[PDB]
Design a binder for this molecule. Structure first.
Ligand SMILES: C=C[C@@H](O)CCCCC
Ligand SMILES: C=C[C@H](O)CCCCC
Lengths: 159, 155
């Protein structure tokens, strides 16, 4: 018998996430204009389909791009996805607030690059949301006069 | 199992805007002065001040702005920005900030705003796990990019 099945419930970790650090065995991949200089925005985990949808932004050729990548889990436990080549992604450490991962990428020229990363989740609690909505109602502010800054196209550029 | 000692200064660091509401919609519309994306907040218990670092788009371009607020005896804070402001903290903890701001502009017009902000917390052990994995893979420290500080100091 090899290892046993892992009870996986990552669905609730879905939500807004941000990149803290990304390291690489090949500096070119994460330098300015690099394909892996990725600013995370959102992660969605589906325990039933065994997938993870990545939503992030990257600057290419002097232009900002919003990207969406779908990863599929394997018996191996790792995830595979297509993005600037083939990728084998492993979650090394995970909690309600952080994600530490290791990714192996092989580009169109067979070049292998190993990357490490630390991402943090932006947790918005129900208790705090309720406090905000009550206060907003107390001040006579209409719901239509409230702007969402977490999911908004018009935002500042990191570079 | 351990947690850092609770200090008001421990609340300083990267913060992000979640929601901002206004009695005057024009103030938070595109190019409005209060459509602020927070970057960092610095709390100083000694001086009774809070330094705000945010970005706001004006005339089609993003600007980085710094505002220093000073605490009053009644616990509220006063700050000069697009007129006079009295900022009150309604709820505050290690991860969230709910506030109410009263602004009176250069024309005597009053606007009341509400806001919800969240702190981005990076724990020591998580950082250590990242650095250990990074060295396990033979990655040089100079081959690591700090995305968080880039977002905290945009252009
Ligand atoms: C491999 C998928 C990309 O969208 C993420 C790259 C960052 C992980 C180090
Ligand atoms: C007064 C300076 C602060 O940045 C005010 C922001 C108001 C948000 C509710």
């Amino acid at each position: 018998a090899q290892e046993e099945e892992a009870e996986q419930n990552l669905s609730e970790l879905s939500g807004p996430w941000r990149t803290v650090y990304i390291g690489s065995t090949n500096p070119e991949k994460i330098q300015e204009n690099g394909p892996f200089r990725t600013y995370f925005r959102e992660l969605v985990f589906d325990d039933e389909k065994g997938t993870v949808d990545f939503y992030f932004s990257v600057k290419r050729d002097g232009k900002w791009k919003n990207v969406h990548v779908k990863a599929t889990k394997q018996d191996d436990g790792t995830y595979v996805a297509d993005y600037e080549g083939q990728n084998v992604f492993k979650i090394v450490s995970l909690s309600r607030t952080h994600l530490v991962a290791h990714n192996i990428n092989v580009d169109k020229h067979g070049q292998t690059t190993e990357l490490t990363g630390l991402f943090v989740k932006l947790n918005v609690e129900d208790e705090d949301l309720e406090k905000f909505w009550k206060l907003t109602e107390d001040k006579g502010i209409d719901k239509k006069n409230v702007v969402n800054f977490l999911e908004n196209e018009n935002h500042p550029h990191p570079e």
